[PDB]
């Protein structure tokens, strides 16, 4: 998903995100959609785990160290 | 020209849906038992009022 690169590094430097796409995030202040597509697109690398509880998504850094350190 | 009849005991309740009580009354003026049907709440000590006395209510 087209996420501005000045903010992509903000996520890459655990993370949670409300499933509600209407509203902005309270941490980075960027929309919830951009945070969703980045981590979901990264869980397919098996770098994290995508547990969801009460409409909130919890992502835990794991294999991920190889990708994140290189990035 | 009516006569009263004191109640001695209640024989039972009949009449399909129980709404008629059979009571063996007695007449003070002729000291004779009479079996009459009554419509409504009745007790052992009651005294009725009858416009007839020769009708032996038995319902077969």
């Amino acid at each position: 998903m087209r996420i501005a690169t000045k903010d992509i590094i903000a996520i890459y430097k655990c993370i949670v995100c409300h499933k509600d796409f209407v509203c902005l995030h309270p941490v980075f202040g960027i929309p919830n959609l951009q945070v969703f597509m980045l981590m979901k697109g990264l869980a397919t690398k098996k770098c994290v785990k995508e547990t969801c509880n009460w409409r909130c998504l919890y992502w835990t850094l794991n294999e991920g160290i190889a990708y994140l350190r290189q990035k | 020209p009516v006569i009263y009849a004191q109640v001695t005991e209640i024989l039972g309740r009949t009449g399909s849906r129980g709404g008629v009580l059979q009571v063996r009354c007695d007449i003070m003026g002729e000291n004779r038992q009479i079996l009459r049907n009554v419509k409504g709440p009745i007790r052992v000590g009651d005294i009725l009022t009858l416009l007839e006395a020769e009708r032996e209510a038995r319902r077969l």
């Binding site: - | 009516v2 009263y4 009449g15 399909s16 709404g19 008629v20 009580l21 009459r36 049907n37 009554v38 419509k39 409504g40 709440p41 009745i42 007790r43 000590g45 009651d46 005294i47 009725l48 009022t49 009858l50 416009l51 007839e52 009708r55 209510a57 319902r59």
Partner: protein, 184 residues
């Protein structure tokens, strides 16, 4: 010497001719019956044969509180009877309570019919129907009529008292007896 009066105007020195109702009518046998007001909150509907302990002037008040939009208004019914009871005294120059007991005796049918056959009517049912018939006659007559309810009730009790057939209670009484008369 506690001597209550029904409205501080009417006393309870009345005699019931019909001895069948002499015990099921609460007038002056016990001091609890003689009340300055027909408003007592007693629990007369918790055990069988307990309404016989209600003051008879009060039982008349309760039956005068019917047909929906008058539900629960005992205060209206108390006012109506108090106004009516003075009128009955004017019409007869007797005790209004003494008039009322005579009306109850003479307006209560002594024979009815159930599914036919002619059956007798219990002494407690005679009092129940009597208040049920005069109250019906007064209520219907006063409906859409210039006369007030108190005047309508007063005229009903006097007529039904002695023998008059103009009263609605008497008209329905003879009709009820006549049908059962032929049903022996």
């Amino acid at each position: 010497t506690f001597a209550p009066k029904l409205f501080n105007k009417w006393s309870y020195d009345v005699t019931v001719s019909d001895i069948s109702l002499k015990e099921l009518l609460a007038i002056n046998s016990k001091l609890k019956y003689q009340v300055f007001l027909p408003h007592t909150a007693g629990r007369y509907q918790i055990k069988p044969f307990r309404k016989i302990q209600c003051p008879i002037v009060e039982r008349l008040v309760c039956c005068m509180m019917q047909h929906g939009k008058n539900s629960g208004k005992k205060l209206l019914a108390m006012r109506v009877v108090e106004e009516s009871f003075e009128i009955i005294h004017l019409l007869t120059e007797k005790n209004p309570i003494q008039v009322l007991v005579d009306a109850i005796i003479n307006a209560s049918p002594r024979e009815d019919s159930t599914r036919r056959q002619a059956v007798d009517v219990s002494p407690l049912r005679r009092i129940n129907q009597a208040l049920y018939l005069m109250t019906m006659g007064c209520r219907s007559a006063a409906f859409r009529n210039s006369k007030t309810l108190a005047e309508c009730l007063a005229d009903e009790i006097v007529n039904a008292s002695k023998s008059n057939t103009a009263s609605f209670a008497i008209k329905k009484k003879e009709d009820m007896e006549r049908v059962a008369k032929s049903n022996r």
